[PDB]
């Protein structure tokens, strides 16, 4: 991921240069892993947002029978006594009843004598839609009408789950369970490589993730891998070799993640626009103003250049760029900028990369006062809900 800030490991030489040697950095996260090569490829991730096929459409099926004894009371009365009781359905009956219902027909649906009793016994099955949930980590099928919370059968062969009422069974709408793990999209990403080695990818939004520390995880039949940050994707030759502890969970794929991801990626773009735009006005106004060198800082860790102005001239040195995690790790004192081991003595109020000592003695870094990439980086961290197992226990 992107750091908050970057800072030279050490600063030694400070050689001079002309404004036409100003380079804007390309900020490739994958470079710090040693992979500067980006070839397209295609990977599987969860569908975005709602997963209509983690839910399983089905129907309860209860068997009733209504008896009606129509006796003549001997008063000359004609009296009718009703009894209602239950019975247990067979799966094949329930299916035929359901199919009968989905298309209109005749669905659901007495002589006196003087001295005869008459008993009509009607044997209905009632069919109400009932949705039940599935654990995509491993195909079991949970609901609170099932007696242990878990279906009595198990994917791919569920003729019927057993419910808590001996007279009611649950059948699934599609006895095949053929749609019931279509929860995947195929997206197009850009894989970052070094010859053969695969170090990470940018997903369909442009957001880079590293493969380092990624365990293997099979989700609802498809064997993918779990990326450190928690998200899950499957593609052909992962080079991942450590199965996950079942403790581990993946994350959902909600839309605002994908949205906020895209915000991050246009943020990286806009700093690279703003660096060329600055470097243009630098060469076409032929006036370089120290405030603005801030734009040439290598946003990613790695090797690069650093820039200042002294003795009137403009000048550079070649550095390794440490990741900076907390502002306080480089600003321990007021007025102190921790480069390597000592503070950085500013000459007539300037240090490198546009960092100055303001008139109050404080070390002003422009990125520190407002950075839209950093504010967005936090929202992403906050849109990440882990996809948990079913709660029914
Ligand atoms: C691959 O890694 C080697 C070793 O550091 C490096 O010399 C080479 O430039 C790399 N190739 C890339 C990043 O395409
Ligand atoms: Tb080093
Ligand atoms: Tb009787
Ligand atoms: Tb929104
Ligand atoms: Tb929106
Ligand atoms: Tb331009
Ligand atoms: Tb301080």
Q: How far apart are CA 300 and CA 317, in angstroms?
A: 17
| The token pair that represents 179 in the structure block | 């749609």
- Method used to determine the 3D structure: X-ray
Neighbours of 82 (CB within 10 A): 9
CA of 387 to the centre of ligand 5 (A): 22
Q: Which residue has the tokens 């878990």?
A: 150
From the list 341, 298, 337, 339, the residue with the least C-alpha distance to 321 is: 298
Return the bridge partners of 391, or none: none
Atom of ligand 1 lying closest to residue 37 CA: 14
Atom of ligand 1 lying closest to residue 197 CA: 1
Identify the structural domains of the chain with CATH numbers, from first to last.
5-22+274-373 (2.30.30.640), 55-172 (no CATH)
Instruction: Select from 29, 31, 34, 193 the residue to mutate for testing ligand 1; criterion: most ligand atoms less than 8 Å from CB.
Output: 34
Smallest CA separation from ligand 1 atom 4, residue:
34
CA of 194 to the centre of ligand 1 (A): 6
Long-range residue pairs from 358-361, CB within 8 A, at least 24 positions apart, any chain: 361/334, 361/335
Atom of ligand 1 lying closest to residue 31 CA: 13
CA distances from 100 to 63, 97, 125 (A): 15, 5, 11
Instruction: Select from 26, 33, 36, 194 the residue to mutate for testing ligand 1; criterion: most ligand atoms less than 8 Å from CB.
Output: 194
Smallest CA separation from ligand 1 atom 9, residue:
34
Declared resolution, Å = 2.9
CA distances from 319 to 96, 177, 209, 306 (A): 76, 59, 25, 7
CA distances from 300 to 1, 95, 183, 210, 279 (A): 9, 61, 35, 14, 19
């Amino acid at each position: 991921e992107f750091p908050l800030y970057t800072i030279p490991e050490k600063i030694e030489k400070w050689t001079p240069i002309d404004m036409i040697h100003l380079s804007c950095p390309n900020n490739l996260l994958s470079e710090e892993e040693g992979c500067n090569a980006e070839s397209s490829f295609t990977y599987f991730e969860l569908k975005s947002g709602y997963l209509a096929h983690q839910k399983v459409p089905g129907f309860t099926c209860t068997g009733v029978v209504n008896e009606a004894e129509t006796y003549t009371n001997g008063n000359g009365s004609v009296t009718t006594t009703f009894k209602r009781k239950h019975f247990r359905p067979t799966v094949a009956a329930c299916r035929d009843a359901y199919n009968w219902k989905v298309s209109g027909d005749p669905r659901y649906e007495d002589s006196s004598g003087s001295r005869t009793v008459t008993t009509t016994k009607e044997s209905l099955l009632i069919i109400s839609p009932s949705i039940v949930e599935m654990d995509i980590y491993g195909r079991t099928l949970h609901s609170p009408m099932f007696p242990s919370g878990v279906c009595s059968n198990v994917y791919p062969s569920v003729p019927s789950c057993e419910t808590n009422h001996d007279y009611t069974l649950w059948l699934p709408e599609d006895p095949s369970l053929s749609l019931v793990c279509d929860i995947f999209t195929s997206s197009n990403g850009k894989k970052a490589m070094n010859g053969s080695r695969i170090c990470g990818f940018k997903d369909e939004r442009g957001f880079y993730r590293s493969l380092k520390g990624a365990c293997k995880l099979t989700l609802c039949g498809r064997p993918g891998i779990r990326l450190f940050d928690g998200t899950w994707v499957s593609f052909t030759k992962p080079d991942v070799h450590v199965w996950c502890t079942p403790n581990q969970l993946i994350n959902i794929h909600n839309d605002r993640l994908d949205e906020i991801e895209h915000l991050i990626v246009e943020d990286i773009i806009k700093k690279r626009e703003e660096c060329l735009d600055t470097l243009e006005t630098i060469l076409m106004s032929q006036s370089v103003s120290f405030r603005r060198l801030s734009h040439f800082r290598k946003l990613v860790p790695g090797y690069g250049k650093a820039y200042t102005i002294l003795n009137g001239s403009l000048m550079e040195t070649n550095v390794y760029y440490k990741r900076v995690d907390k502002w306080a790790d480089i600003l321990p004192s007021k007025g102190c900028l921790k480069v390597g081991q000592q503070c950085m003595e500013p000459v007539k109020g300037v240090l490198f990369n546009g960092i100055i000592k303001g008139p109050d003695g404080q070390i002003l870094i422009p990125e520190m006062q407002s950075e839209q990439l950093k504010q967005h980086m936090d929202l992403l961290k906050a849109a990440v809900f882990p996809l948990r197992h079913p709660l029914i226990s």
